[PDB]
Amino acid sequence: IDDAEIARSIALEDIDVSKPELFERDGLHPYFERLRREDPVHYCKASEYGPYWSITKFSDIVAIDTNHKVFSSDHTNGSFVLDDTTLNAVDGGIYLPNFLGMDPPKHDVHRMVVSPIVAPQNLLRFEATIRERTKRVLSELPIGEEFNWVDRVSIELTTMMLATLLDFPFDDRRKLTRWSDIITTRPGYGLVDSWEQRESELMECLAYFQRLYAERQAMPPKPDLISMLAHSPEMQDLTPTDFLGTLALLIVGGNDTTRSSMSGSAMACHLYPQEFDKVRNNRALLASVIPEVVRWQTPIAHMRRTALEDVEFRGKQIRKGDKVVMWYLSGNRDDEVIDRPMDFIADRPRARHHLSFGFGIHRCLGNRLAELQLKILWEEMCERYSRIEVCGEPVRVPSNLVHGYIDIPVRLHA
């Protein structure tokens, strides 16, 4: 398929950027280029998820994200992703309510329970712990033999990081990757064969975490996420559904995003070897490289809202009940705000000014944890490797939400 030809040729009204097939072949940029130029607040009438608004420009996306009283995230209105099966009991899905899918006032009550995980002193302890654990993984990677970087680096380090945050048994940490993966999938997408199989694996997740929760309730408070839920007065009446929904948020939130950033790091070093060379020669560039990895990869391609009011936005009449989608993958390529945004630039000015963590009351809680783990990985790459070679076909995730990789064949050079 030639996405450039279609995007030039078809009527504006027939553009649907939501198809997971487009993400699998990273074919979105010709469509987004046309929408940002010709119709930046665009109504799509025909899609699998019903009709929706696409918000494609940087400034416009900030406006939606920061107006939570007009543009709702609440689970009672359908929650915060475009595909209604991921978090609602519809068409084979199950109900997964959580504080990212809550509007105020309840949102703030739940966020405050887990916000100590990024207290300053915990970030310092976390950084010291991660450093040694990361060193140990990287020092066993072969030189001059092909391996899947997603398997040996992205998953290996990400599941070690999330296990540290949950104090999850280290020997079972592969379960965290499995549970994360099935939350954002559908039957036939290559992970589960049925909705029922998905439901079974999530009940197994619930049973495992319930055992851990009961253990944490009976020991002193510790700086781990399950401990924080287990000792919180305001969390004592979670229904089974709310508990499972909250676990889903913490498992996917810390897993899929960081994994995708680690996979993008390898792609960046191969496609832009001179930028890797720069930071290797000058380690002060880590400050600008890490936010740029996250902007360039954009691990979460969109977040979705539902309008609670009729509202005229940039000249367009949004109606109460309409789906509104913030395309972070488009916004992070808006050259009104970001110069030469298709390329990876180790040394970019105002490198923290990107959309990948959102803006407003739902801005990513764990952004400092991700950035510290990515810093430590780049420190180690810089010390151990002359270059990172992608030597076979990359295989991408079929999702309009998770913007990441299944397979990146690499060879390391020293």
Cβ–Cβ contacts within 10 Å for residue 173, how many? 19
From the centroid of its chain, how far is CA 406? Answer: 15
**Angle between helical axes of 156-166 and 120-138 (0-180°, round to 10):** 150
**Does the footprint of ligand HEM cover residue 29 (CB under 6 A)?**
no
Q: x/- binding map, residues 78-107, to ligand HEM, per CB under 6 A?
A: ---------------------xx-------
Q: Does 363 bind ligand HEM (CB under 6 A)?
A: yes
Q: CB under 8 Å to 207, separation ≥6 — which residues?
A: none
Is residue 313 annotated as involved in ligand binding? no
User: Which range, of 1-9, 16-24, 298-306, 384-392, touches ligand HEM by CB under 6 A?
Assistant: 298-306
Collapsed DSSP state (helix, strand, coil) of residue 110: helix
CB of 143 to ligand HEM, least distance (A): 28
Residue 370: name the closest of 297, 301, 281, 284 by CA.
297
Q: Which of 78, 97, 358, 398 binds ligand HEM (CB under 6 A)?
A: 358
Using the rule CB under 6 A, give the single segment among 183-191, 331-339, 354-362, 400-408 that binds ligand HEM: 354-362
**Helix (H), strand (E) at residue 297:** helix 286-297
Neighbours of 300 (CB within 10 A): 23
Q: Say if CB 44 and CB 15 are below 8 A apart.
A: yes
Binding status of residue 301 toward ligand HEM by CB under 6 A: no
The token duo for 173 is 């940490």
300 binds ligand HEM (CB under 6 A): yes
Place of tokens 């253990």: 215
User: Is residue 150 a contact residue for ligand HEM (CB under 6 A)?
Assistant: no
366 near ligand HEM, rule: CB under 6 A: yes
Q: Decide: residue 2, CB within 10 A, 0-12 exposed, 13-18 middle, 19+ buried.
A: exposed
Q: Which two tokens stand for residue 13?
A: 């009204």
Identify residues 50-69 at the interface with ligand HEM (CB under 6 A).
65
Is 163 a residue that touches ligand HEM (CB under 6 A)? no
Beta carbon of residue 13, minimum distance to ligand HEM (angstroms, whole number) = 28
**Binding status of residue 7 toward ligand HEM by CB under 6 A:** no
| Residue 305 annotated in ligand binding | yes
User: CB of 258: closest distance to ligand HEM in angstroms?
Assistant: 5
Least separation, in Å, of the C-beta of 2 and ligand HEM?
Answer: 30
- Residue number with CB closer to ligand HEM (67 or 148): 67
Please state, in angstroms and rounded to a whole number, the distance separating the CA atoms of residues 139 and 137. Answer: 6
CA dihedral for 91, 96, 101, 106, sign (positive or negative): positive
Residue 306, helix vs strand vs coil: strand
- Asked if 357 is part of the footprint of ligand HEM (rule: CB under 6 A), the reply reads yes
One of 364, 390, 395, 406 touching ligand HEM (CB under 6 A) = 364
**What does the block give as tokens for 6?**
């279609």
Closest separation in Å from C-beta 303 to ligand HEM? 4
Least distance in angstroms from the C-beta of 294 to ligand HEM: 5
Nearest to 247 by CA among 219, 232, 225, 231: 225
Q: Which is nearer to ligand HEM, 61 or 346 (CB)?
A: 61
- Per CB under 6 A, 330 contacts ligand HEM: no
Write the DSSP symbol of residue 300. Answer: B
CB of 65 to ligand HEM, least distance (A): 5
Nearest to 165 by CA among 82, 28, 257, 103: 257
Torsion angle in degrees (nearest 10) through CA of 398, 404, 409, 412: 180
369 near ligand HEM, rule: CB under 6 A: yes
Annotated binding site for heme b: 107, 111, 305, 359, 362, 364
Per CB under 6 A, residues contacting ligand HEM are 65, 99-100, 111, 165, 249, 253-254, 257-258, 261, 294, 299-300, 303, 356-360, 362-366, 369-370
